[PDB]
Amino acid sequence: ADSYYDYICIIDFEATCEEGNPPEFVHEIIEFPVVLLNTHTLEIEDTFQQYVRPEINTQLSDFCISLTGITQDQVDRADTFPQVLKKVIDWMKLKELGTKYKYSLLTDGSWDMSKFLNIQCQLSRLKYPPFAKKWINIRKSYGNFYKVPRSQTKLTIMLEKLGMDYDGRPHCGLDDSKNIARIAVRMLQDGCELRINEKM
Numbered sequence: 001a002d003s004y005y006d007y008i009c010i011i012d013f014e015a016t017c018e019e020g021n022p023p024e025f026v027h028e029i030i031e032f033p034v035v036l037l038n039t040h041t042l043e044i045e046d047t048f049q050q051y052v053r054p055e056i057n058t059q060l061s062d063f064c065i066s067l068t069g070i071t072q073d074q075v076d077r078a079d080t081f082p083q084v085l086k087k088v089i090d091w092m093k094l095k096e097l098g099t100k101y102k103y104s105l106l107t108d109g110s111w112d113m114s115k116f117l118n119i120q121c122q123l124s125r126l127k128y129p130p131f132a133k134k135w136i137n138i139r140k141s142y143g144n145f146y147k148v149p150r151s152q153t154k155l156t157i158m159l160e161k162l163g164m165d166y167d168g169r170p171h172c173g174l175d176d177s178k179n180i181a182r183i184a185v186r187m188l189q190d191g192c193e194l195r196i197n198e199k200m
């Protein structure tokens, strides 16, 4: 398996939303998961998961709660986005990412990590983190490696094509991140050289 990176960090956010995806509703991140994939052992070595308390639209819609399974009380008890991002940065530093170990972020598309983070950093008046400015977009990697159209790189289809079931609850951010990590593991086992393929 490709050992170009020592670790791959999979991040797939959940955000506030309304039914019908209205463009005037401003998204806030409500779940910040990180799955740490060891490229040498091909094991998920560790995970990070925190909910995040939205401030612009504090009350989750019924649609959002139904979609993600995240409840109002779970976000009520959560820390602010700046506090959660601080914890993520600490955790990554603890894992020695970017110092002892070479690493990349891996995502399920541009929206699913970068655009939500971009919106949220605007809202929180934070710099968009340089470490998140490039990533492996696994839909692009999968499409190019298995030679399938974009229509066939939906998360459930990627799993099904490879003889895998979805493990856990779809639209739980940590569970989606884990399933994306499972696909990445199989791609590495299959001989794919996963590489950064998208920049902001």
Ligand SMILES: Nc1ncnc2c1ncn2[C@@H]1O[C@H](COP(=O)(O)O)[C@@H](O)[C@H]1O
Binding pocket: 012, 013, 014, 015, 016, 017, 018, 019, 020, 021, 067, 068, 112, 170, 171, 172, 176
């Ligand atoms: N069907 C949908 N309708 C409205 N928003 C959605 C829908 N699917 C996903 N989203 C939004 O996009 C986020 C990430 O999607 P996902 O990674 O599939 O859970 C969700 O947390 C929602 O904010």
Ligand SMILES: [Mg+2]
Binding pocket: 012, 013, 108, 112, 176
């Ligand atoms: Mg996603």
Ligand SMILES: [Mg+2]
Binding pocket: 012, 013, 014, 171, 172, 173, 176, 177
């Ligand atoms: Mg998700």
